[PDB]
Amino acid sequence: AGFIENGWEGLIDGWYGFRHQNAQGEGTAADYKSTQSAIDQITGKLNRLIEKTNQQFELIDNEFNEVEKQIGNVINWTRDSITEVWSYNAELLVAMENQHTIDLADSEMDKLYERVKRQLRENAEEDGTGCFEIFHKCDDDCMASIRNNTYDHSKYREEAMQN
């Protein structure tokens, strides 16, 4: 949410996509290779956090016949301490993972932006709101070439440099 003042609620096909507007018409198509990268990383986080322990813990209390009061107070004291430790670890873990997730998605967006920028060396100029100004009407074949990273950086240059 940097220079992109908002998101596209109509982009139901992916996480990151393109929305062009030349003289031929309109177009909005998701970028699968960045969406799949962020999705892969979130999937990895879920694989590391959704975890099963192989450590078995046994009963040291008794709900039906209460144990000695002193040893029961030691047991309750220890259990409460461990509960505090795990509540802290859980809260901190969730907060940190969420921070890194948000920053990760933002980073993916920015790196995609600068990639498309480096594809258009001097034939385009940054507008300041996440869009690129082309100084020559790029048709839809040129659009598809921009998407799959095949647009030629010099076979459209001179024409745009004049403009």
Partner: protein
Amino acid sequence: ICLGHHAVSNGTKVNTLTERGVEVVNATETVERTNIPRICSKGKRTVDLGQCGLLGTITGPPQCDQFLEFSADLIIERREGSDVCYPGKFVNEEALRQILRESGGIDKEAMGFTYSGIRTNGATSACRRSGSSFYAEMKWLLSNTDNAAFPQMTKSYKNTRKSPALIVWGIHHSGSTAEQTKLYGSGNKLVTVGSSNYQQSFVPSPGARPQVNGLSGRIDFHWLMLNPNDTVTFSFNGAFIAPDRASFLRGKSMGIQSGVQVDANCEGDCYHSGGTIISNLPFQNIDSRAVGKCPRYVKQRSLLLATGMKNVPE
């Protein structure tokens, strides 16, 4: 040309290092709250003790007649269970319970104690079978006839097996000194037990107690764990409940206390008194005293983990 990211009209608020209430596209729960109100025992040898108390399986009251040599991966104690028919209790009872919960079951072996000069068929109406009986694994040693004395006795048992043996005996405390004389004669009675790890005699103590099952006498149950080839000896002169069979631990198991039904249709490794916790989440807010292989208990009822990007709608 413009490039951007997706968004939704209604997202999920989460918490971060910086804020509390950040809208994200998608989020999932990390703290488990859904509980199955059954004991999921699919694929495990399960023994529901019911009216039999766990310690009773060693002494054998009538409610434990069918649990004298049980074998289990999962042992379930019930609230209606009872270790005794004649009123009494165990010394170091909870340690023995924790021993028996992970025992994997018990295997009994006759200790081969033979008697000459005393009676051996003490019974009572509280331990009801056909008529009046007693603990199936114990023997109530008394005097010959109309009172009379109890001779100083010494019986020895040697553990010939490669695993520790559970030995349990009992000291009888009658309702009066007159009844103690009637059963075993007058004079101070003394019960001495020794081995390699053990060294503790007991002294009886007659007197009036509150009537439990209409009876004022109490039976103290005691136990030691003999080591292989180690020998234990009892030197007793009365007020003695002799062990007839010793116990041996079968293998390994888990013990739980619950009040819900057994279900062989679901599988679970995390149990509590209210059922089974089946979850892949790392945390749970159901029961802090859950046992087995559980997610760690936390006090927060919900901790949402972000699975999507920041949500910024128009």
